């Protein structure tokens, strides 16, 4: 550990933007659409769409862990604490060569294969007061989730029920104990944000996460169900996360696509409610892959040599 | 702990001047682990230079740092309006880091003697059981001033307080208040109340006074 | 771009304890930035309090045993936050407390020397004023008469009061002095104006005083 006190701000961390831009370029030479449409305006309202048609090679895009080592004239500083807001003065900081192996998983609503919370479930937010700022949840115990191009994902109803609890409890432990915690599905928006979207085998899965976010701080949902089955769908025409615009990928082909990932975290986003009675409603969120990266770099910060 | 003793406590300068502020550390600092900050009235300090001579990103290059033996100095070339305020040195050689007492850099001006005024307690205050006598020194330079209170010719100790404005942005003068407070009882007892002010602009100490009830 | 946003002013009774907060916008993770807390007593220089560095906290000799410093990484709703707890407040704890951040990522940087460092980003500061006084609106007294005249705004708590003249229409030649703290633990200030002696019976002068913490607003006419 480094014997000094420094400031950290994962919400304004620059490595996030440095990885994000990398992960995008890690996408332009691995997953290339058959056609990519992107807004093109002079400002005069009228906006032509810039079209691009390239080969559409079916590749089973399988993410490789990524390290981030400071070159020279530069040093990475890691924060150490069982519960770090990731936005303030860190006491147990410590210089490191490369950040832990991170598997740049691009997804929405659920953070897959990320890094678990050592102690307990932690939830960071650039401002919990602002019903506009994504709440990044960090699970201390991942929940396996298996998706298949066959059309769905299975999740443990047990583990997910617990998780919502040990999350619902960490929420009121920030918005007011004497406050009811509820979970509802997406409010609306793009398919990629409304469902738990992500990529598996180069196939863009779109799983309906209603059964994962319709939890009332009162009842249950395990009648005749051992596992939660999200009705997933693979799309060819998708909205790009790298930049405003659609993109069409070629249909599936491999006799079988399969994924078994660790739900290591979520991206929630409680609704304003305009100071109404203690009844905070949290819904799935994300779509801004940087929050993802953040959830992984929340305790890092590269700095110039002295 | 390392002591940093800063020099001078105040200096007066003009726009375009070159200015030097110095800090002597009580021990040698081989590594040059020294920093300089600026603080403007009402605001948080800002780091200007670290490691003795390195300029932080965004700081004008008219600022520079230097060292000789146990002395460290900040130099400001082409002094600018936003530069006026208070400067601090800090060692971070050894735990705990420590700061100098600070240096105030204010605007140079020609000498101007205070206009002096004295206000007896109002009848409304007297009615509420208290008495405050106020003496005002208006628009003077330099800031150094002495005011003494006398009642029935007796020097007054421990029952007065002073307040000074910030240097005025337009005429670069100061103004100062001194308030003498006493019970309604003693106020009504004595006859003559006097404010005595001494200042460089005044060829001789000026006394403004009144007799109670005029 | 780093902006450090501290919690608001607090007025605290002696013996009490307080926790001040710092939201570190632009800071990734306290794994890469150290937090150093510092305080400045009124009209005084600056003094180091303690730090959290690499998730390890500590406090200077003068404050050890009386202060807890913590930090947590957060995202979405909030940026990373650090806080400073102070126990058994006394009068000599009254001061502006600054949270401060310095990146520790680059060992070679020269901002830091084995845990002892310069402070590259500062918060606005939070005033902690330690006092047994209770909130109280001022009395306003006329300072009657180139002539000078004004208003004495006496015995209020806490700060601030605001003063304008003639609803803001008179600003030239106006001096409103910083408040002083009296032996009674209440504040007092005065506001003065210089005017031509000629207009004294022709022109009207009224000082508008506003003390929001007591919801007090007075308008005092100042007559020769
Ligand atoms: C379409 O977009 C282009 C930009 O390449 C612009 O110059 C043109 O005015 C727009 N109108 C047309 C050709 O549809
Ligand atoms: C954190 O994880 C542990 C097990 O790893 C669990 O027992 C604990 O309850 C969790 N904290 C919560 C409830 O968020
Ligand atoms: C925190 O969020 C609230 C609204 O929820 C906003 O008004 C406030 O300014 C935010 N904090 C800051 C100062 O960024
Ligand atoms: C997911 O697949 C793994 C094998 O990779 C299996 O061990 C686990 O039981 C599955 N989880 C389900 C279907 O709940
Ligand atoms: C919750 O608010 C306070 C805790 O701050 C508690 O004393 C009160 O009894 C509770 N009231 C509600 C909102 O049910
Ligand atoms: C699945 O999601 C759709 C909207 O995406 C919703 O209307 C529908 O009711 C959901 N079905 C389930 C599994 O409850
Ligand atoms: C949430 O509550 C509503 C109404 O009380 C119910 O219809 C819904 O099924 C609940 N969510 C689940 C499945 O736990
Ligand atoms: C609810 O269903 C789960 C499996 O889906 C089962 O493990 C659990 O025991 C059920 N609840 C009870 C205790 O009846
Ligand atoms: C990560 O996910 C796999 C896939 O189900 C699971 O089998 C494995 O135990 C998980 N490992 C972790 C991170 O605990
Ligand atoms: C890690 O998560 C990804 C989700 O994109 C999944 O495809 C992969 O199988 C997981 N790791 C394992 C167990 O292969
Ligand atoms: C909270 O519930 C509703 C919110 O729509 C509100 O009308 C009511 O006054 C509040 N308190 C009650 C009755 O539970
Ligand atoms: C203050 O802390 C001291 C030890 O530092 C302890 O003896 C004392 O009880 C505390 N005072 C109060 C009022 O809590
Ligand atoms: C590490 O311990 C030393 C003890 O001499 C101290 O000077 C330094 O500030 C400490 N650093 C931390 C973890 O704050
Ligand atoms: C960091 O240092 C603090 C101060 O001694 C200590 O309490 C904490 O356990 C350390 N954290 C780790 C395990 O790196």
Keywords:
part of a larger assembly, 3 chains, A: 306 residues, mainly beta, HIV Envelope Protein Gp120, Chain G, eleven-stranded mixed beta sheet, 4 helices, 14% helix, globular, C: 224 residues, Immunoglobulin-like, 2 domains, seven-stranded mixed beta sheet, binds 2-acetamido-2-deoxy-beta-D-glucopyranose
Topology of helices and strands:
The structure is cut from a larger assembly and holds chains A (306 residues), B (214 residues) and C (224 residues).
Chain A: E1 6-9, H1 14-25, E2 35-41, E3 47-52, E4 66-69, E5 74-78, E6 87-90, E7 94-96, E8 98-102, E9 110-112, E10 122-124, E11 135-148, E12 152-156, H2 157-175, E13 180-183, H3 191-194, E14 196-200, E15 203-207, E16 215-216, E17 227-235, E18 237-239, E19 246-248, E20 258-270, E21 279-284, H4 289-297, E22 300-304
Parallel strand pairs in A: 13-21
Antiparallel strand pairs in A: 1-6, 2-3, 2-19, 4-8, 5-7, 5-22, 9-20, 10-11, 11-12, 11-20, 12-17, 13-16, 14-15, 15-17, 18-19, 20-21
Helix pairs in contact in A: 1-4
Chain B: E1 4-7, E2 10-13, E3 19-25, E4 34-39, E5 46-50, E6 54-55, E7 63-68, E8 71-76, E9 85-91, E10 98-99, E11 103-107, E12 115-119, H1 123-127, E13 130-140, E14 146-151, E15 154-155, E16 160-164, E17 174-183, H2 184-189, E18 192-198, E19 206-211
Parallel strand pairs in B: 2-11
Antiparallel strand pairs in B: 1-3, 3-8, 4-5, 4-9, 5-6, 7-8, 9-10, 9-11, 12-13, 13-17, 14-15, 14-18, 16-17, 18-19
Chain C: E1 3-6, E2 10-12, E3 18-25, E4 33-40, E5 46-53, E6 56-59, E7 67-72, E8 81-86, E9 95-103, E10 112-113, E11 116-117, E12 121-122, E13 126-130, E14 139-143, E15 147-156, E16 162-165, E17 174-176, E18 180-181, E19 187-195, E20 206-211, E21 216-221
Parallel strand pairs in C: 2-13
Antiparallel strand pairs in C: 1-3, 3-8, 4-5, 4-9, 5-6, 7-8, 9-12, 9-13, 10-11, 14-15, 15-19, 16-20, 17-19, 18-19, 20-21
The structure holds 2-acetamido-2-deoxy-beta-D-glucopyranose (14 copies).
């Amino acid at each position: 550990l480094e014997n000094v006190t420094e400031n950290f701000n994962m919400w304004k961390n620059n490595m996030v933007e440095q990885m994000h831009e990398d992960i995008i370029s890690l996408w332009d030479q691995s997953l290339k659409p058959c056609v990519k449409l992107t807004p093109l305006c002079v400002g005069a309202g009228s906006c032509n769409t810039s079209v691009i048609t390239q080969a559409c090679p079916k590749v089973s895009f399988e993410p490789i862990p990524i390290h981030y080592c400071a070159p020279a004239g530069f040093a990475i500083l890691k924060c150490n604490d069982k519960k770090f807001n990731g936005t303030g003065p860190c006491t147990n900081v410590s210089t490191v060569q490369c950040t832990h192996g991170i598997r740049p998983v691009v997804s929405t609503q659920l953070l897959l294969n990320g890094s678990l919370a050592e102690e307990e479930i932690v939830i960071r937010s650039e401002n919990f007061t602002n019903n506009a700022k994504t709440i990044i949840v960090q699970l201390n115990e991942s929940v396996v989730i298996n998706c298949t191009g066959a059309g769905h994902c299975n999740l443990s109803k047990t583990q997910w029920e617990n998780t919502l609890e040990q999350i619902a409890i960490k929420l009121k432990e920030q918005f007011g104990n004497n406050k009811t915690i509820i979970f509802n599905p997406s409010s609306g928006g793009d398919p990629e944000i409304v469902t738990h979207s992500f990529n598996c085998g180069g196939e863009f899965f779109y799983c309906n996460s209603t059964q994962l976010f319709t939890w009332n701080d009162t009842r249950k949902l395990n009648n005749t169900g051992r596992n939660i089955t999200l009705p997933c769908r693979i799309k060819q025409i998708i909205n790009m996360w790298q930049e405003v615009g659609k993109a069409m990928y070629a249909p599936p082909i491999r006799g079988q696509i399969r994924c078994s990932s660790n739900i290591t975290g979520l991206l929630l986003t409680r609704d304003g409610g305009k100071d109404t009675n203690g009844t905070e409603i949290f819904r799935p969120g994300g779509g801004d892959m940087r929050d993802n990266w953040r959830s992984e770099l929340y305790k890092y910060k590269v700095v110039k040599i002295e | 702990d390392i002591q940093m003793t800063q020099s001078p406590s105040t200096l007066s300068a003009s726009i375009g001047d070159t200015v030097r502020i110095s800090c002597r550390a009580s021990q040698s600092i081989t590594g040059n682990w020294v920093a300089w900050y600026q603080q403007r009235p009402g605001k948080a300090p800002r780091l200007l230079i670290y490691r003795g001579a390195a300029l932080l990103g965004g700081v004008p290059s008219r600022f520079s740092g230097s060292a000789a033996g146990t002395d460290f100095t900040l130099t400001i070339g082409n002094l600018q309006a936003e530069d006026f305020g208070t400067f601090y040195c800090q060692q971070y050689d050894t735990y705990p880091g420590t700061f100098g007492q600070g240096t105030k850099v204010e605007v140079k001006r020609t000498v101007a003697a205070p206009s002096v005024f004295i206000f007896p307690p109002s009848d409304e205050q007297l009615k509420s059981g208290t008495a405050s006598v106020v003496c005002l020194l208006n628009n003077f330079y330099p800031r150094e001033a002495k005011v003494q209170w006398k009642v029935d010719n007796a020097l007054q100790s421990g029952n007065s307080q002073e307040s000074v404005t910030e240097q005025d942005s337009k005429d670069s003068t100061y103004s100062l208040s001194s308030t003498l407070t006493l019970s309604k009882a003693d106020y009504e007892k004595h006859k003559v109340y006097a404010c005595e002010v001494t200042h460089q602009g005044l060829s001789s100490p000026v006394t403004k006074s009144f007799n109670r009830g005029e | 771009q780093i902006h450090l946003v501290q919690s608001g002013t607090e007025v605290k009774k002696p013996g009490s304890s307080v926790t001040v907060s710092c939201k570190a916008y632009g800071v990734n993770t306290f794994g890469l930035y150290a937090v150093n807390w510092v305080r400045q007593a009124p009209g005084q220089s600056l003094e180091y309090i303690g730090q959290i560095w690499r998730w390890k906290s500590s406090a200077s000799h003068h404050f050890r045993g009386r202060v807890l410093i913590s930090a947590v990484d957060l995202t979405g709703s909030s940026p990373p936050i650090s806080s400073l707890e102070i126990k058994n407040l006394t009068s000599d704890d009254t001061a502006v407390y600054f949270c401060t951040t310095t990146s520790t990522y680059d060992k070679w940087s020269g901002l830091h020397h084995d845990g002892v460092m310069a402070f590259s980003s500062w918060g606005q500061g939070t005033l902690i004023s330690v006092s047994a006084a209770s909130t109280k609106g001022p009395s306003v007294f006329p300072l009657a008469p180139t002539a000078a005249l004004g208003c004495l705004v006496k015995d209020y708590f806490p700060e601030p009061v605001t003063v304008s003249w003639n609803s803001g229409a008179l600003t030239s030649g106006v001096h409103t002095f910083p408040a002083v703290l009296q032996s009674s633990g209440l504040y007092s200030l005065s506001s003065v104006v210089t005017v031509p002696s000629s207009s004294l019976g022709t022109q009207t002068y009224i000082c508008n005083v506003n003390h929001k913490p007591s919801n007090t607003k007075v308008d005092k006419r100042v007559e020769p």
